[PDB]
Design a protein around this ligand. Structure first.
Ligand SMILES: Cc1cc2nc3c(=O)[nH]c(=O)nc-3n(C[C@H](O)[C@H](O)[C@H](O)COP(=O)(O)O)c2cc1C
Ligand SMILES: Cc1cccc(NS(=O)(=O)c2nnc(NC(=O)c3ccc4ccccc4c3)s2)c1
Ligand code: SF4
Length: 363
């Protein structure tokens, strides 16, 4: 209960602790996880990606081959609505974020869906989101946070936003190459010291000065309070952590509770992705299937991302990301796709969200 960490303002919202739990798709950070995180005083973040899979396609208008049909059902507005409502059953009006990748043509639709669902903050990476306020203008209080890989991206985003909307972002998340999910770096760049998070945060904070010290949130490889204090000392206003929350009981993708305590370092790797960024995965499930020559059939049903071009890149790399992540949420251990930060092998026990926050904030 006693902490020396100080409350964090993001636009018009305040969170008790300067910690975000990073969004994780598909079905990893939904209502149980995000709700309990926000209940603890950190920022819970609901993933808006693949919400059609929620409760085994409870809220989709059409299913093909046990997949949500097209982007309208993959990014399901009614599913998102119920996920926010069920999270707020836990955390009340405590601030909640909605994480939405940029690499989708229906980006504005999902952004407005998140706003109408009750999100206080929109977080967007997997691209350079130069037009978030275009879609958020009916919702003045919703704070807008790009995820960036470099100080150059901060400067570009601030200039484009300022010139077009007379608004600049409410915060920036800089994500490094030790993160879960997709990386904002070429594979070769993920191993280079120049892109380590401790080197990115100083540059991004210095770039932020020019625009009035927009708060910076460091993400990628942050494990414990020592890492948090390191990032804060480098100028970051907060941290975003995901892998630690991937190992909590309240994770909405229950498979991880059985997968992580067995996870060995040598079974984490960077792979290719239809999204067009390296993805950090566990060497299990669909990956193993592909290497056996038992790859699931690929035929684009959910149309989840623009860079794939309705199956072109999925067929090239060998897997459909929507299919695999949805299968993981539904408990398919043989054909699921499973993601992790570099630190995933350090998960020994599955603990509660409350005990994790107590660890991260005590003192
Ligand atoms: C399993 C998993 C799935 C993720 N999926 C997404 C995602 O869909 N969208 C996103 O912006 N970030 C995603 N991330 C990245 C996290 O939000 C976060 O920025 C990063 O994992 C933090 O690093 P850490 O895991 O070392 O704390 C994912 C991370 C993990 C571990
Ligand atoms: C600027 C820049 C570039 C790259 C990464 C970052 N870093 S990041 O925005 O924090 C992210 N890390 N992982 C992410 N994963 C996803 O978008 C994702 C996860 C699951 C999907 C499933 C189906 C379809 C699309 C899907 C997309 S996004 C920042
Ligand atoms: S084939 Fe490509 S665009 Fe279609 S659902 Fe799979 S990854 Fe997404």
């Amino acid at each position: 209960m006693v902490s020396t960490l100080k409350p964090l303002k993001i636009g018009k919202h305040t969170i008790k602790f300067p910690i975000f739990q990073g969004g994780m798709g598909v079905g990893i950070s939904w209502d149980e996880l995000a709700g309990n995180v926000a209940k603890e005083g950190a920022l819970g973040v609901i993933s808006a990606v693949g919400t059609g899979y929620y409760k085994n396609m409870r809220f989709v208008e059409r299913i093909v081959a046990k997949k949500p049909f097209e982007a309208l059902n993959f990014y399901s507005k009614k599913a998102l609505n119920e996920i926010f409502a069920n999270a707020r059953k836990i955390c009340g009006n405590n601030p909640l974020g909605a994480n939405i990748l940029y690499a989708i043509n229906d980006y504005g639709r999902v952004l407005r869906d998140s706003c109408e669902a009750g999100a206080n903050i929109i977080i967007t990476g997997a691209g350079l989101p130069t037009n978030m306020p275009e879609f958020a203008k009916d919702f003045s209080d919703v704070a807008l946070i790009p995820i960036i890989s470099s100080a150059k991206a901060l400067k570009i985003l601030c200039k484009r936003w300022s010139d077009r909307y007379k608004r600049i972002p409410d915060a920036f998340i800089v994500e490094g190459p030790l993160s879960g999910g997709h990386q904002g770096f070429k594979y070769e760049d993920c191993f280079k010291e120049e892109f380590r998070l401790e080197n990115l945060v100083p540059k991004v904070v210095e770039a932020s000065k020019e625009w009035g010290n927009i708060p910076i949130i460091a993400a990628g490889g942050i494990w414990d309070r020592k890492d948090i204090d390191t990032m804060l000392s480098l100028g970051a206003s907060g941290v975003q952590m995901a892998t630690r929350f991937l190992g909590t009981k309240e994770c909405d993708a229950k498979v991880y509770a059985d997968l992580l305590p067995t996870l060995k370092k040598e079974d984490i790797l960077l792979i290719k992705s239809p999204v067009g960024y390296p993805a950090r995965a566990i060497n299990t499930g669909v990956i193993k299937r592909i290497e056996e020559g038992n790859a699931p059939k690929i035929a684009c049903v959910s149309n989840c991302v623009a860079p794939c071009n309705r199956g072109e890149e999925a067929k090239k790399v060998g897997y459909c990301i929507a299919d695999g992540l949805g299968r993981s949420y539904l408990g398919n251990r043989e054909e699921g796709l499973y993601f992790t930060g570099a630190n995933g092998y350090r998960v020994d026990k599955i603990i509660s969200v409350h005990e994790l926050i107590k660890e991260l904030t005590e003192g």
